[PDB]
Structures are given as structure tokens and as C-alpha cells.
Amino acid sequence: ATSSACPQYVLINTRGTGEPQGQSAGFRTMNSQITAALSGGTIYNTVYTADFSQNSAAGTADIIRRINSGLAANPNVCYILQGYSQGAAATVVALQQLGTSGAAFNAVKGVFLIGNPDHKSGLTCNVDSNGGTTTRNVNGLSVAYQGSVPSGWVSKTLDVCAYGDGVCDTAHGFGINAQHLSYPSDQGVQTMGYKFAVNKLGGSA
């Protein structure tokens, strides 16, 4: 189907530490679903090292580069920003830099995060792998210094934290564990991400 709201869109995804340059395993299934549901889509894989240091500036910069380059070519292009683990942090910092007004903000229809080190207790974008609230009121490993999804972005963000994922849920989790690695094959996560994106892009799902 063609979305009248978004005849062309880009799923910009930023991967986790150690994933090969390419699409994150975190979004492969949902992105196959989104692009099959809505025409005019491409999947852009943020270019950066995704190294263990967690210094992700090049990732943040490349997200924003892709957003701005797209808008230069098509002022009506739509984006979904997706980030897993280090890539979620890189995405959060992109939101902080983009601000909450202007062309880039307007073009980003949704932000979908999994295993977010910057997960912030109490934000209403926060859901668990089943779409519930069991990880709403927990903090990630990095939020204290790196900050959070800005308030003006929350209404179009979904920050998915599996119960007991130690990266986004330091209350119930304990470091990088199976829960942090679960997202690529979690059917709740993949389906939620696909429906979220298609709906934010103006389609039916």
C-alpha cells in the first residue's frame, strides 16, 4: 500500500555493539514487515564502528546526516528512527541534538528503541516486550550521564525494554544477559515495532 502521509520513507536503524555493519538483527523482521506493507521504503543502516567504548558520536552524526540529506532531496520524506543497545543511545542523543521543532523533527514520525542504555524511569513511551508496563519505572545503565529521550519526543517514541534486560532495566536485570539479546526474535517486540512504524507512517496495521 502507499501511505498518502508518507509515499517515501526511510527506516534508519542503528545497531548494537559488535553487530556487523549492516542492518541490526534487532529490526530485521519488523523491517521486512514494514517494507512489505508500505511501498516507497528503504532501510538505512547507520555507519559507525559500534565499538565497545560506547562513544557513539559517529552514529548520532550519521543518523542526522541521513535525515538532512533525505530532506534536501524530498522535503516530504518520512523517517522512523530505530536503535538497539549502543544504537539506541546514539538515537537518543540524535533526538537531543535535533530538538523538538523544525523540519527534521517534523519528518521523524516515530522513534523505536530496544535495549536502551538511556532508558529513563517513568516515561510513558516505555513498554516491555509484551507492550505492558513492567519495565516502565526502571533506568538504564547510561541514563544518568547520557540523558534520556527528550520530553518533546516521548509522544512518538516507543522504548521497549525486556523485563530483566540489564542494559535498560538495572532494577531487574544484570548486565548484558539473554534478555538484552532477545529482541531480534521476540515476536512481541518485532510485531509491535512493525505496527508502530506502519501506523506512524500513516498506513494500516
Short mmCIF file of all heavy atoms in Angstrom, two decimals, residues 18-81:
data_model
loop_
_atom_site.label_atom_id
_atom_site.label_comp_id
_atom_site.label_asym_id
_atom_site.label_seq_id
_atom_site.Cartn_x
_atom_site.Cartn_y
_atom_site.Cartn_z
N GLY A 18 29.21 -4.68 18.26
CA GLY A 18 29.62 -5.96 17.73
C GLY A 18 28.84 -6.47 16.55
O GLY A 18 29.29 -7.39 15.87
N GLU A 19 27.66 -5.92 16.29
CA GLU A 19 26.92 -6.35 15.10
C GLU A 19 27.69 -5.90 13.87
O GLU A 19 28.24 -4.80 13.86
CB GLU A 19 25.53 -5.74 15.08
CG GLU A 19 24.63 -6.19 16.22
CD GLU A 19 23.18 -5.95 15.90
OE1 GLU A 19 22.56 -6.84 15.26
OE2 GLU A 19 22.66 -4.87 16.24
N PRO A 20 27.78 -6.73 12.83
CA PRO A 20 28.43 -6.30 11.60
C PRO A 20 27.74 -5.07 11.02
O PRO A 20 26.53 -4.92 11.15
CB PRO A 20 28.25 -7.50 10.66
CG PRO A 20 28.08 -8.66 11.58
CD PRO A 20 27.30 -8.13 12.74
N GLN A 21 28.52 -4.19 10.40
CA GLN A 21 27.93 -3.10 9.64
C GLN A 21 26.92 -3.70 8.65
O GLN A 21 27.23 -4.64 7.93
CB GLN A 21 29.01 -2.31 8.91
CG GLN A 21 28.49 -1.11 8.11
CD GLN A 21 27.86 -0.04 9.00
OE1 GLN A 21 28.54 0.54 9.85
NE2 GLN A 21 26.57 0.21 8.80
N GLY A 22 25.71 -3.15 8.65
CA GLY A 22 24.57 -3.77 8.01
C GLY A 22 23.37 -3.55 8.91
O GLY A 22 23.49 -2.91 9.96
N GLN A 23 22.22 -4.08 8.52
CA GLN A 23 21.02 -3.92 9.34
C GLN A 23 21.19 -4.63 10.68
O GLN A 23 21.73 -5.73 10.75
CB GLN A 23 19.79 -4.45 8.61
CG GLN A 23 18.50 -4.12 9.34
CD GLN A 23 17.23 -4.56 8.63
OE1 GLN A 23 16.15 -4.15 9.04
NE2 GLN A 23 17.33 -5.38 7.60
N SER A 24 20.73 -3.99 11.75
CA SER A 24 20.73 -4.65 13.05
C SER A 24 19.79 -5.84 13.05
O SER A 24 18.67 -5.77 12.51
CB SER A 24 20.29 -3.67 14.13
OG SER A 24 20.21 -4.31 15.39
N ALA A 25 20.23 -6.93 13.67
CA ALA A 25 19.35 -8.07 13.90
C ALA A 25 18.11 -7.65 14.68
O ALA A 25 17.06 -8.28 14.57
CB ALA A 25 20.09 -9.16 14.64
N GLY A 26 18.22 -6.57 15.46
CA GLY A 26 17.09 -6.07 16.23
C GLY A 26 15.88 -5.65 15.41
O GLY A 26 14.78 -5.63 15.94
N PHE A 27 16.08 -5.32 14.13
CA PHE A 27 15.00 -4.77 13.31
C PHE A 27 14.71 -5.54 12.04
O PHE A 27 13.82 -5.17 11.30
CB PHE A 27 15.24 -3.28 13.01
CG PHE A 27 15.64 -2.53 14.22
CD1 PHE A 27 16.95 -2.13 14.40
CD2 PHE A 27 14.72 -2.31 15.24
CE1 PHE A 27 17.34 -1.48 15.57
CE2 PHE A 27 15.10 -1.67 16.40
CZ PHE A 27 16.41 -1.25 16.58
N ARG A 28 15.45 -6.61 11.79
CA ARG A 28 15.34 -7.30 10.51
C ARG A 28 13.91 -7.77 10.21
O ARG A 28 13.38 -7.52 9.13
CB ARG A 28 16.30 -8.49 10.47
CG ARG A 28 16.61 -9.01 9.07
CD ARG A 28 17.74 -10.04 9.02
NE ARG A 28 18.73 -9.86 10.08
CZ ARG A 28 20.04 -9.74 9.89
NH1 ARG A 28 20.55 -9.76 8.67
NH2 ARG A 28 20.84 -9.58 10.94
N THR A 29 13.29 -8.45 11.16
CA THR A 29 11.95 -8.97 10.92
C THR A 29 10.94 -7.84 10.76
O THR A 29 10.23 -7.79 9.75
CB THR A 29 11.56 -9.94 12.02
OG1 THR A 29 12.37 -11.11 11.87
CG2 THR A 29 10.12 -10.44 11.83
N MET A 30 10.89 -6.92 11.71
CA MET A 30 9.91 -5.85 11.60
C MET A 30 10.10 -5.05 10.32
O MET A 30 9.12 -4.65 9.70
CB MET A 30 9.91 -4.94 12.83
CG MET A 30 11.14 -4.05 13.00
SD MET A 30 11.09 -3.09 14.52
CE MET A 30 11.40 -4.37 15.75
N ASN A 31 11.34 -4.84 9.91
CA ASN A 31 11.58 -4.05 8.71
C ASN A 31 11.17 -4.76 7.43
O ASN A 31 10.71 -4.12 6.49
CB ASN A 31 13.00 -3.53 8.66
CG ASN A 31 13.23 -2.43 9.67
OD1 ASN A 31 12.28 -1.95 10.29
ND2 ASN A 31 14.48 -2.02 9.83
N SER A 32 11.32 -6.09 7.41
CA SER A 32 10.75 -6.87 6.32
C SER A 32 9.23 -6.70 6.27
O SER A 32 8.64 -6.60 5.20
CB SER A 32 11.17 -8.34 6.41
OG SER A 32 10.47 -9.03 7.42
N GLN A 33 8.59 -6.64 7.44
CA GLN A 33 7.14 -6.46 7.51
C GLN A 33 6.71 -5.06 7.08
O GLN A 33 5.74 -4.91 6.34
CB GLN A 33 6.64 -6.72 8.93
CG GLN A 33 6.82 -8.14 9.42
CD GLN A 33 6.19 -8.30 10.78
OE1 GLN A 33 5.02 -8.70 10.87
NE2 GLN A 33 6.92 -7.96 11.82
N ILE A 34 7.43 -4.04 7.54
CA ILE A 34 7.07 -2.65 7.25
C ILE A 34 7.20 -2.39 5.75
O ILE A 34 6.29 -1.85 5.13
CB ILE A 34 7.95 -1.66 8.04
CG1 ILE A 34 7.73 -1.80 9.55
CG2 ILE A 34 7.69 -0.22 7.59
CD1 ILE A 34 8.93 -1.37 10.38
N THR A 35 8.35 -2.77 5.18
CA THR A 35 8.59 -2.51 3.76
C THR A 35 7.67 -3.32 2.86
O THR A 35 7.37 -2.89 1.75
CB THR A 35 10.06 -2.69 3.36
OG1 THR A 35 10.51 -4.02 3.69
CG2 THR A 35 10.96 -1.71 4.12
N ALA A 36 7.22 -4.49 3.32
CA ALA A 36 6.24 -5.27 2.57
C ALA A 36 4.85 -4.65 2.65
O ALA A 36 4.05 -4.78 1.72
CB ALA A 36 6.21 -6.72 3.04
N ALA A 37 4.56 -3.97 3.76
CA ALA A 37 3.25 -3.37 3.98
C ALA A 37 3.07 -2.04 3.25
O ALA A 37 1.99 -1.75 2.73
CB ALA A 37 2.98 -3.19 5.47
N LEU A 38 4.13 -1.25 3.22
CA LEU A 38 4.09 0.10 2.66
C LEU A 38 5.18 0.29 1.62
O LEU A 38 6.36 0.11 1.90
CB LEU A 38 4.25 1.16 3.75
CG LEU A 38 3.12 1.34 4.75
CD1 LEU A 38 3.51 2.42 5.75
CD2 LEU A 38 1.80 1.70 4.06
N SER A 39 4.76 0.67 0.42
CA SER A 39 5.69 0.97 -0.65
C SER A 39 6.47 2.26 -0.38
O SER A 39 6.07 3.09 0.44
CB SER A 39 4.93 1.10 -1.98
OG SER A 39 4.01 2.17 -1.91
N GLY A 40 7.59 2.40 -1.09
CA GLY A 40 8.39 3.61 -1.02
C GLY A 40 9.38 3.65 0.13
O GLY A 40 9.93 4.71 0.44
N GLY A 41 9.62 2.49 0.74
CA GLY A 41 10.51 2.40 1.87
C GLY A 41 11.90 1.89 1.53
O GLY A 41 12.08 1.04 0.65
N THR A 42 12.88 2.40 2.26
CA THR A 42 14.22 1.83 2.26
C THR A 42 14.70 1.72 3.70
O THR A 42 14.18 2.39 4.60
CB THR A 42 15.23 2.67 1.45
OG1 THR A 42 15.22 4.01 1.94
CG2 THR A 42 14.87 2.74 -0.05
N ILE A 43 15.70 0.87 3.89
CA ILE A 43 16.31 0.62 5.18
C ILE A 43 17.73 1.15 5.14
O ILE A 43 18.56 0.67 4.35
CB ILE A 43 16.30 -0.90 5.49
CG1 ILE A 43 14.87 -1.45 5.52
CG2 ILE A 43 17.03 -1.17 6.81
CD1 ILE A 43 14.78 -2.96 5.41
N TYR A 44 18.01 2.16 5.96
CA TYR A 44 19.34 2.76 6.03
C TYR A 44 20.02 2.33 7.31
O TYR A 44 19.50 2.55 8.40
CB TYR A 44 19.28 4.30 5.98
CG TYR A 44 20.66 4.89 6.07
CD1 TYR A 44 21.53 4.80 4.99
CD2 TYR A 44 21.13 5.47 7.25
CE1 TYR A 44 22.81 5.29 5.06
CE2 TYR A 44 22.42 5.97 7.33
CZ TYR A 44 23.26 5.88 6.23
OH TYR A 44 24.54 6.36 6.26
N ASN A 45 21.20 1.74 7.17
CA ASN A 45 21.98 1.26 8.30
C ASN A 45 23.04 2.28 8.69
O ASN A 45 24.00 2.52 7.94
CB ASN A 45 22.64 -0.08 7.98
CG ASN A 45 21.70 -1.05 7.31
OD1 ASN A 45 20.56 -1.25 7.76
ND2 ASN A 45 22.16 -1.67 6.23
N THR A 46 22.87 2.90 9.85
CA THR A 46 23.79 3.92 10.31
C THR A 46 25.23 3.42 10.26
O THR A 46 25.53 2.31 10.71
CB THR A 46 23.41 4.29 11.73
OG1 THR A 46 22.08 4.80 11.70
CG2 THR A 46 24.29 5.42 12.28
N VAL A 47 26.11 4.25 9.71
CA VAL A 47 27.51 3.89 9.58
C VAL A 47 28.30 4.44 10.76
O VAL A 47 28.39 5.65 10.95
CB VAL A 47 28.12 4.39 8.25
CG1 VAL A 47 29.59 4.02 8.16
CG2 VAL A 47 27.35 3.82 7.07
N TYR A 48 28.84 3.52 11.55
CA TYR A 48 29.74 3.85 12.65
C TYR A 48 30.39 2.56 13.12
O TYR A 48 30.05 1.48 12.62
CB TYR A 48 29.03 4.60 13.79
CG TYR A 48 28.21 3.79 14.78
CD1 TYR A 48 28.42 3.96 16.15
CD2 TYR A 48 27.20 2.92 14.37
CE1 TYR A 48 27.68 3.26 17.09
CE2 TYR A 48 26.45 2.21 15.31
CZ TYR A 48 26.70 2.39 16.67
OH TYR A 48 25.98 1.72 17.62
N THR A 49 31.33 2.66 14.04
CA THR A 49 32.10 1.49 14.44
C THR A 49 31.32 0.53 15.33
O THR A 49 31.63 -0.66 15.35
CB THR A 49 33.39 1.88 15.18
OG1 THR A 49 33.07 2.78 16.24
CG2 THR A 49 34.35 2.65 14.27
N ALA A 50 30.35 1.04 16.08
CA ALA A 50 29.64 0.23 17.08
C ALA A 50 30.64 -0.52 17.96
O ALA A 50 30.52 -1.73 18.18
CB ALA A 50 28.64 -0.72 16.40
N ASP A 51 31.65 0.20 18.43
CA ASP A 51 32.72 -0.42 19.21
C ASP A 51 32.37 -0.44 20.70
O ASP A 51 31.45 0.25 21.14
CB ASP A 51 34.07 0.26 18.95
CG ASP A 51 34.12 1.69 19.44
OD1 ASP A 51 34.13 1.90 20.67
OD2 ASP A 51 34.14 2.67 18.66
N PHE A 52 33.11 -1.23 21.47
CA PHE A 52 32.72 -1.43 22.86
C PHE A 52 32.85 -0.20 23.76
O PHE A 52 32.29 -0.18 24.84
CB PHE A 52 33.39 -2.67 23.49
CG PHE A 52 34.84 -2.48 23.84
CD1 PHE A 52 35.23 -1.75 24.96
CD2 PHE A 52 35.82 -3.07 23.06
CE1 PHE A 52 36.57 -1.59 25.28
CE2 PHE A 52 37.17 -2.92 23.38
CZ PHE A 52 37.54 -2.18 24.49
N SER A 53 33.58 0.82 23.31
CA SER A 53 33.77 2.02 24.14
C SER A 53 32.46 2.72 24.49
O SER A 53 32.38 3.38 25.53
CB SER A 53 34.71 3.03 23.47
OG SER A 53 34.06 3.77 22.45
N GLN A 54 31.46 2.58 23.61
CA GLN A 54 30.17 3.28 23.69
C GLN A 54 30.26 4.76 23.34
O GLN A 54 29.32 5.52 23.59
CB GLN A 54 29.46 3.07 25.03
CG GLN A 54 29.28 1.61 25.42
CD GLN A 54 28.67 0.79 24.31
OE1 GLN A 54 27.59 1.11 23.81
NE2 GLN A 54 29.34 -0.28 23.92
N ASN A 55 31.38 5.17 22.75
CA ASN A 55 31.47 6.52 22.22
C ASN A 55 30.88 6.52 20.82
O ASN A 55 31.52 6.11 19.85
CB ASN A 55 32.91 7.03 22.30
CG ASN A 55 33.37 7.21 23.74
OD1 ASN A 55 32.69 7.84 24.54
ND2 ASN A 55 34.51 6.62 24.07
N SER A 56 29.62 6.94 20.74
CA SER A 56 28.79 6.71 19.57
C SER A 56 28.55 7.95 18.71
O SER A 56 27.65 7.95 17.86
CB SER A 56 27.45 6.11 20.02
OG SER A 56 26.75 7.01 20.85
N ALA A 57 29.36 8.99 18.89
CA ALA A 57 29.17 10.25 18.16
C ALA A 57 29.03 10.07 16.65
O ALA A 57 28.22 10.74 16.02
CB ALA A 57 30.28 11.23 18.45
N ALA A 58 29.83 9.18 16.06
CA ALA A 58 29.76 9.00 14.61
C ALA A 58 28.40 8.43 14.19
O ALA A 58 27.90 8.73 13.11
CB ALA A 58 30.90 8.13 14.11
N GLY A 59 27.80 7.60 15.05
CA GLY A 59 26.48 7.06 14.79
C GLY A 59 25.42 8.14 14.83
O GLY A 59 24.62 8.28 13.90
N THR A 60 25.41 8.93 15.90
CA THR A 60 24.50 10.05 16.00
C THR A 60 24.62 10.98 14.79
O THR A 60 23.62 11.39 14.21
CB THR A 60 24.79 10.81 17.30
OG1 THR A 60 24.47 9.97 18.42
CG2 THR A 60 23.93 12.08 17.42
N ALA A 61 25.86 11.30 14.42
CA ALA A 61 26.09 12.20 13.29
C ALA A 61 25.54 11.62 11.99
O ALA A 61 24.99 12.36 11.17
CB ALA A 61 27.57 12.52 13.15
N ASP A 62 25.69 10.32 11.79
CA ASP A 62 25.26 9.71 10.54
C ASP A 62 23.73 9.57 10.46
O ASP A 62 23.16 9.69 9.38
CB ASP A 62 25.96 8.38 10.30
CG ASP A 62 25.81 7.90 8.89
OD1 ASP A 62 26.15 8.66 7.96
OD2 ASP A 62 25.33 6.77 8.65
N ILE A 63 23.07 9.35 11.60
CA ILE A 63 21.61 9.40 11.63
C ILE A 63 21.12 10.76 11.12
O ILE A 63 20.26 10.85 10.24
CB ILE A 63 21.08 9.19 13.08
CG1 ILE A 63 21.35 7.77 13.56
CG2 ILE A 63 19.59 9.52 13.17
CD1 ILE A 63 21.21 7.63 15.08
N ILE A 64 21.69 11.81 11.70
CA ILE A 64 21.27 13.17 11.37
C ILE A 64 21.64 13.51 9.93
O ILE A 64 20.85 14.14 9.22
CB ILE A 64 21.84 14.17 12.40
CG1 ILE A 64 21.21 13.91 13.78
CG2 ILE A 64 21.60 15.60 11.94
CD1 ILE A 64 21.83 14.69 14.92
N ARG A 65 22.81 13.07 9.49
CA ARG A 65 23.23 13.24 8.10
C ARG A 65 22.19 12.65 7.14
O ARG A 65 21.80 13.30 6.16
CB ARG A 65 24.61 12.61 7.86
CG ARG A 65 25.05 12.56 6.40
CD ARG A 65 25.94 11.36 6.08
NE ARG A 65 25.29 10.41 5.18
CZ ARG A 65 24.40 9.49 5.54
NH1 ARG A 65 24.00 9.39 6.80
NH2 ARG A 65 23.88 8.67 4.63
N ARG A 66 21.75 11.42 7.41
CA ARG A 66 20.77 10.78 6.54
C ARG A 66 19.44 11.52 6.54
O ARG A 66 18.82 11.69 5.49
CB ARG A 66 20.56 9.30 6.91
CG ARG A 66 19.61 8.55 5.99
CD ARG A 66 20.12 8.46 4.56
NE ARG A 66 19.22 7.82 3.62
CZ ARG A 66 18.21 8.43 2.99
NH1 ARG A 66 17.92 9.71 3.24
NH2 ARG A 66 17.48 7.76 2.11
N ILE A 67 19.00 11.97 7.72
CA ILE A 67 17.77 12.74 7.82
C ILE A 67 17.85 13.99 6.95
O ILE A 67 16.95 14.27 6.14
CB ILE A 67 17.48 13.13 9.29
CG1 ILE A 67 17.10 11.89 10.10
CG2 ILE A 67 16.39 14.20 9.37
CD1 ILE A 67 17.07 12.13 11.60
N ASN A 68 18.93 14.75 7.11
CA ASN A 68 19.06 16.01 6.41
C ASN A 68 19.27 15.84 4.91
O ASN A 68 18.72 16.60 4.12
CB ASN A 68 20.15 16.87 7.05
CG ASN A 68 19.75 17.40 8.42
OD1 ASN A 68 18.57 17.58 8.71
ND2 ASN A 68 20.74 17.65 9.26
N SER A 69 20.03 14.82 4.52
CA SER A 69 20.24 14.57 3.09
C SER A 69 18.94 14.18 2.41
O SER A 69 18.67 14.62 1.29
CB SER A 69 21.26 13.45 2.89
OG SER A 69 22.56 13.83 3.30
N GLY A 70 18.13 13.37 3.09
CA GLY A 70 16.83 12.99 2.56
C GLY A 70 15.92 14.19 2.39
O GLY A 70 15.26 14.33 1.36
N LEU A 71 15.88 15.06 3.40
CA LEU A 71 15.00 16.23 3.33
C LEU A 71 15.40 17.19 2.23
O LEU A 71 14.54 17.84 1.62
CB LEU A 71 14.93 16.95 4.68
CG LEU A 71 14.07 16.22 5.71
CD1 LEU A 71 14.37 16.71 7.12
CD2 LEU A 71 12.60 16.37 5.37
N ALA A 72 16.70 17.28 1.96
CA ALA A 72 17.18 18.09 0.84
C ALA A 72 16.66 17.58 -0.51
O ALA A 72 16.38 18.38 -1.40
CB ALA A 72 18.70 18.14 0.83
N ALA A 73 16.52 16.27 -0.64
CA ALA A 73 16.05 15.63 -1.87
C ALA A 73 14.53 15.56 -1.97
O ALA A 73 13.96 15.58 -3.07
CB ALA A 73 16.64 14.25 -2.00
N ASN A 74 13.88 15.46 -0.81
CA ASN A 74 12.43 15.33 -0.74
C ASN A 74 11.96 15.91 0.58
O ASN A 74 12.03 15.24 1.61
CB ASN A 74 12.01 13.86 -0.86
CG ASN A 74 10.51 13.67 -0.73
OD1 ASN A 74 9.76 14.64 -0.64
ND2 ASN A 74 10.08 12.42 -0.70
N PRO A 75 11.47 17.16 0.58
CA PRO A 75 11.06 17.80 1.83
C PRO A 75 9.92 17.07 2.53
O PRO A 75 9.65 17.34 3.70
CB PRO A 75 10.63 19.20 1.40
CG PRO A 75 10.32 19.08 -0.03
CD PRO A 75 11.28 18.05 -0.58
N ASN A 76 9.26 16.15 1.83
CA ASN A 76 8.13 15.42 2.37
C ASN A 76 8.43 13.98 2.78
O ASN A 76 7.53 13.23 3.11
CB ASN A 76 6.97 15.47 1.37
CG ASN A 76 6.57 16.89 1.05
OD1 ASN A 76 6.11 17.61 1.93
ND2 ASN A 76 6.79 17.31 -0.18
N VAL A 77 9.71 13.61 2.77
CA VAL A 77 10.11 12.28 3.21
C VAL A 77 9.79 12.07 4.70
O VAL A 77 9.83 13.02 5.49
CB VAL A 77 11.60 12.00 2.90
CG1 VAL A 77 12.54 12.83 3.78
CG2 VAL A 77 11.93 10.51 3.00
N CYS A 78 9.46 10.83 5.05
CA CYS A 78 9.22 10.45 6.44
C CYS A 78 10.31 9.52 6.94
O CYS A 78 10.87 8.74 6.17
CB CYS A 78 7.90 9.73 6.55
SG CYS A 78 6.48 10.68 5.99
N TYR A 79 10.56 9.56 8.25
CA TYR A 79 11.52 8.67 8.88
C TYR A 79 10.94 7.94 10.08
O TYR A 79 10.12 8.50 10.83
CB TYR A 79 12.72 9.47 9.39
CG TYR A 79 13.45 10.21 8.31
CD1 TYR A 79 13.33 11.58 8.18
CD2 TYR A 79 14.26 9.53 7.41
CE1 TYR A 79 14.00 12.27 7.18
CE2 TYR A 79 14.93 10.20 6.41
CZ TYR A 79 14.80 11.56 6.29
OH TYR A 79 15.48 12.21 5.29
N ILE A 80 11.40 6.71 10.26
CA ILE A 80 11.35 6.05 11.57
C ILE A 80 12.80 5.85 11.98
O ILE A 80 13.60 5.34 11.20
CB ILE A 80 10.63 4.69 11.51
CG1 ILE A 80 9.21 4.81 10.94
CG2 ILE A 80 10.65 4.01 12.88
CD1 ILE A 80 8.23 5.59 11.81
N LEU A 81 13.14 6.27 13.20
CA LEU A 81 14.48 6.03 13.75
C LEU A 81 14.42 4.84 14.69
O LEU A 81 13.61 4.82 15.62
CB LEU A 81 15.01 7.25 14.50
CG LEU A 81 14.96 8.59 13.76
CD1 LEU A 81 15.62 9.67 14.61
CD2 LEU A 81 15.59 8.51 12.38
#
